[model samples]
Target: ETKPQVDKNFADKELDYANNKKDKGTVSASVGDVKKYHVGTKILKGSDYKKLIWTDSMTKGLTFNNDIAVTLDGATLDATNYKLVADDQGFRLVLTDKGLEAVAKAAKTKDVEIKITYSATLNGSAVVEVLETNDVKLDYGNNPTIENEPKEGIPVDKKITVNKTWAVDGNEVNKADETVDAVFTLQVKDGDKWVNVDSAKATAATSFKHTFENLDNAKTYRVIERVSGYAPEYVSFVNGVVTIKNNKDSNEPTPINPSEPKVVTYGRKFVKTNKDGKERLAGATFLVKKDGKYLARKSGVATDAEKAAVDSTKSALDAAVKAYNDLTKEKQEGQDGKSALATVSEKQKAYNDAFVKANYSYEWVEDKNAKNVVKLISNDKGQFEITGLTEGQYSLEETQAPTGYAKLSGDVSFNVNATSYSKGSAQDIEYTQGSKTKDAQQVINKKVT
Candidate 1:
């Protein structure tokens, strides 16, 4: 009789860090999901668990509470099982004996899994072209000496981004192609060949800008005008941003070269002034529309969902500023210009501003991911300033009026103009706004006699 060969099998599943933000930066495709990630987790398989080296590179785009829980089959592994060393880039997880034993028992039982979860927020700095990649892996082995390997675990990665958008800018020439919708074809580089992926038209209403959402950033892409009757010239491809310029000559225009990013250091400031133009009136919300879409804002009254969101963002910002105002100078400088236990109490004794520190000014929350959409709500000074808009024609509609006041009679129309902006402080920034150009488009709120 032939000797039976032994059957040995292991690692049926290597490591599980199933990322839901695979397609876009969102946790899921559902619109009802919150814009931030409340849960960050990883699942694992295999045996002889030691420790985990979880590293991430979303330094500017992500932040999270310093809390991590390790569980086996949905049961917590207790305090002694794991220790988390949270750093700016990521964290290190050292598994204790209890943790290793618990994980081992789960594998022995053959039905459970070891899972680690935490609360991580994107914090709204996610860029359109770059992804937020967090990597985690297990370190497991039987021996610690040269005879055996201890770092034998498979590495799993979680890639996330918030609101990935690709678009071709500029304006639809209100000049020639007003009647016909000129076609523009977008082609993506696949392997070695370019494939036509999508198409959009330069509609006058959209200001001739075409936006594409949830595209694979790994692939190289380009857009070309399909109509020979006209030619478009774009300055460059910046964060997938393009400005379709009209070609003057009949010979044909060519070339694409992008310079460093231009921080459109732009903003709009306006006030709800009294009839005599004295103190600015507070509590007017403006809903702005450009390219036929409402720009996302922190506060405004449009739908019931976003209205509450804007208010909360504002409240949190105000609370932080107020807390900073109440801090003593000594305590403010205790933690190197930060409040003691600032993370614990979530208070900032010192504003991030150092030499620029002065008064409690209305600092705008620049959510770079929002890409120029904003919620416009006036402050106590009866003032509002909107910023980070691209070059386009925009209209402001007064959605809500202050208490005991009448809203605007019609929409306020304006346009944002831009020239080549530099990427350095060498070029002085010029601040300008389009409002008040009409000179006090003020509201009237007198009691009906």
Candidate 2:
């Protein structure tokens, strides 16, 4: 049931033969059926005639194509004026007097609740549904309250703590008794219900705790607590269960043998001044696989001071290694004695653990050649020859451009028909300075075979 009339004046103008030449009576129509009125037809003249002319006014105003205008309190009405107003139902559009008169003569008071329908051709079939309104809504405004405290660390016979919180919708949940509960229970498997550990009535002032004894590490159990009487109810931060895993009682077999010495060394160079064609000396530091195990060895006999320092600051790495080997050999050979090998082995493991924890960085260059021409790694000089490559065409290009150097424009390609050393070289490798001048220049090339 809906009110169908617009006004007496508009109805008279629409029904009067003297005023309107054809059917002009205002009639009711749904919002969705408005678009069909755009097509004019003679069927509107008969009793089958529709008194309403659906103007798509709301849809037109909602879109960006048109400018809506409204005159309030006898203001000058044009095409750009608009107003925001509220009504008893909610909000509605109040047209200008001139606009109202034009619509009232041709359109009827909409009798039904104007519901817009959206239609689409889906898979060659017509599908229709109510038009979706773009309005935002908030679903969960309240948060969950804590129900129980949780136990931390290895569960081997340990006491656990749990906390609880609650979610109250549109209200401040301050009363602890109604908001949350604290419970303590024995840890158990999936199918097993929690054994009553203890229950503490929660308040804004204090929470509860539960403890269990004689806990078995081999077996796992769950500890739980709960909070309730919330708007959407409360849930556990974790699954309502806590598990106690087996604890570390004794050392198990290590992933790798601790006696296996892992050593890393880097080269250091020193230049001799005597005109012996640039004499070069290389010294390397051997990082043994054990901490405080290395001893500084003198060339032959040590001075009194050297001996004192060696005794105080340096420890014999060889002794540590020997100790580890002796222990391992004793264990392998089924012998019993205070073996130094076991001590060294554990030291080595500790050294490796420390090394990994230290996060050391390293870089290495491996030549992809068979000749193994052990050439000096250089800041300058020497051609890097790549030999024993598969027989085919190859292009030599700089994978990484050194700092202050320009990259090669095009790749240098050559053919290798047989298994032999082939040479390719690029010279005049230069670095540029701030003034765009050459800072350092060197000539080097690569030989591909």
Candidate 3:
């Protein structure tokens, strides 16, 4: 009364994964995960075919491990009897004339599955916190139509951030500066021993946040912070943020002060001195520029200042809103035919919420015309201190040296990148100058002839 769904003239294909004991539909994944898949199909019964071909496709985030096995019934087939090919689309296993004949003899009497198994591992681009699937198709059969079967992909990736703090002789903590390139080796706890995984270095420019991508959630890992000539204490490894504090030869834990500002400020002091280095000269003037720019943002601080601007603009945006509502259509024409109330109010909340997170932020309001170059003058002590700066390259070019002294023609530039833990030492006091190599933060002038 009913036709059989299991057609004996054609092959029946199935897609399943070895990662789960259940039927193949979806698979749970994490970074560095391995997914084994099975491409199985029952050969056409009561029919003899001498040709068989199969192709399994793999998309991104999944990489084939080159471990494909073909079996008929309960016995493994001879790999030498088949022709194998692979490309970016995945791989294909085709049976030769002799291999097809051997396969034909095995399934000539009864129904059996010619099963194939392969492996796919997770890569860095594997989507994290989401379900990803790719088609693993199998095409075979000579009776009428080729069977195009489908399957799935395996893996996911994540990232970890770094927060570095430096501790010196006293309790004074310098949290992330230009000198803070905390190179670290990420070791994952695998089986019996720990294995190295990634290297994520943190700098003040990145707010001490170094992202290690393609992390496995099920795997346990630790970081060893690298700051040459200093020892580190693990402050925390919380919620994907690895916090390490480097101490100068101190094993005792340096206490962290909550009242202290988390933002680290950089200060550059240059002394204008005579040729002999004995006499300190004053009244030396120089134009200051950072990263070749006259003005830049002051960041890595509490975003309270930005939040203040958010509220101020929100009320002001509402202020003119109702005033425009009182205007007629003709009066509204001046505003490009748009009402300030409808437009501004509609976007008001979103604009304010954009600055919601009270995390470290920056604003250029401090240096208005700030991009127009600022001059630094040496005081009577022959010292000019540049403050309110973070990590970057800085140059102080002599615009005018002390009167009666020859003006230095070129700029004296140095990258203001470093932590304080290794300072005070003459060998480590130098910085990478623009001229060549390590140089002091001093400006020299000579007496006029």
Candidate 4:
């Protein structure tokens, strides 16, 4: 079903040669005439053919010894005029016009054989040298500084003291003989909460000392012993307060009783008079005086003259409001589109000046003196409560009376006694009021006529 395709020149020459088998003719040509011929061989490595292709022209040929080389084949062949050279597919030997004439004159024959020699070897060994370095030791000294030592107190001013020690075999011992270090943590009271302020370590000595300076006496603080690992017996701050420990087999921890602000309650009822001598609870304004000084709650006491000045300023402001309101629309419009009684304008400048001069200040009665004095107003229930008072004597006087009633004849006096006791357990401390021998309540009533 298929046949090979041949060139026309090759097919015609084959046909003519087969048809005229006996047609012989004698042709003559000069010896100087030249013909072309190509010769080539595969490069090899030990009996295996290689892919490397060698190049040579008619006038030039490649030579090989230990390595491959290229040079002119012979002096008789012209080098300046040459044929195309091929370096791929296969190594080729090509004869040019002048190269053929040289070969014919010499009648040289036989294919040249080229053999190249080469060899390589890897032997012996290699080594890498390593240098050694000396070891270093760091010394952590015994007396390292404590950071933020002697911290500040909280709430109110006072001092916090830390007593640290070590124990061995159920007895007080020196740090040199003790195997473990003692750590202590200090905490301070802030408002209604406790915060960790600092920590201390006792290692070089048997005892360590630390104090929180200028802390709030009104607030409280405590220190605790931190124990780690499997410590059989641990030492702790007894009562979780500040105190000293007694040197004993058990090392009795001293209990600390931090002072706290006490609360005292004072109350009174307001009454009014009628034709029938009838009395009822009524509303009234009152001023409290402590140790002969007025307690304004927010600002401290003002002298008699200062109070008079405030009253005069307030009266002037009231008059100005009325006078400004009485102005006509025409008069008020020309007044800078401002409120009739605006405090910043020239017409109302007098009222503003007086208002700033008024005495409006207050302070706690207990803060000013050793004893306490306070003002109270009766509610609809005809009773008043005085809070935030400490344990002391307090006096109460009716400063103003209701429209239909008269002021109290004089001031009434009372006392507050606060005490603490160990109620349930040795660790539990309870505080109580009044006499410790008996539990009772005292009530005083005053009726003004």
TM-score of every candidate: 0.32, 0.16, 0.29, 0.22
Q: Give the TM-score of candidate 4.
A: 0.22
Superposition error at 282 for model 4 (Å): 4.1
| Ten contiguous residues with the weakest lDDT in model 4 | 119-128
Name the candidate that leads on lDDT: 3
Query: lDDT values of the candidates?
Result: 0.38, 0.24, 0.48, 0.30
Candidate 3 accuracy as lDDT: 0.48
- Candidate 4 lDDT for residue 254: 18
In order of lDDT, best first, we have: 3, 1, 4, 2
Least well predicted 10-residue stretch by lDDT in candidate 2: 254-263
Candidate 1 has its poorest 10 consecutive residues by lDDT at 1-10
Q: Predictions ranked by TM-score, top down?
A: 1, 3, 4, 2
Over 1-449, each residue of candidate 2 has an lDDT whose tens digit, in order, gives 12221111121122221222332332221111211111111111111111222111111101111222322222434533212221111111223334333333333432111111111101100011112111101111112122123342324444333443332333333444442222233333323322222223334422233344544454445443221122112123233223321111112211110011011111111111112323211111111111222111121111233234433322443455444344543352343322343443344344333322222121112332212111121121111222212234443434322222234355434433321221112221223213332222132232222
Alpha-carbon error at 313 in model 4, in Å?
20
Give all candidate RMSDs, comma-separated: 23.4, 32.0, 25.3, 50.8
Off by over 4 Å in 1: 1-46, 124-407, 410-449
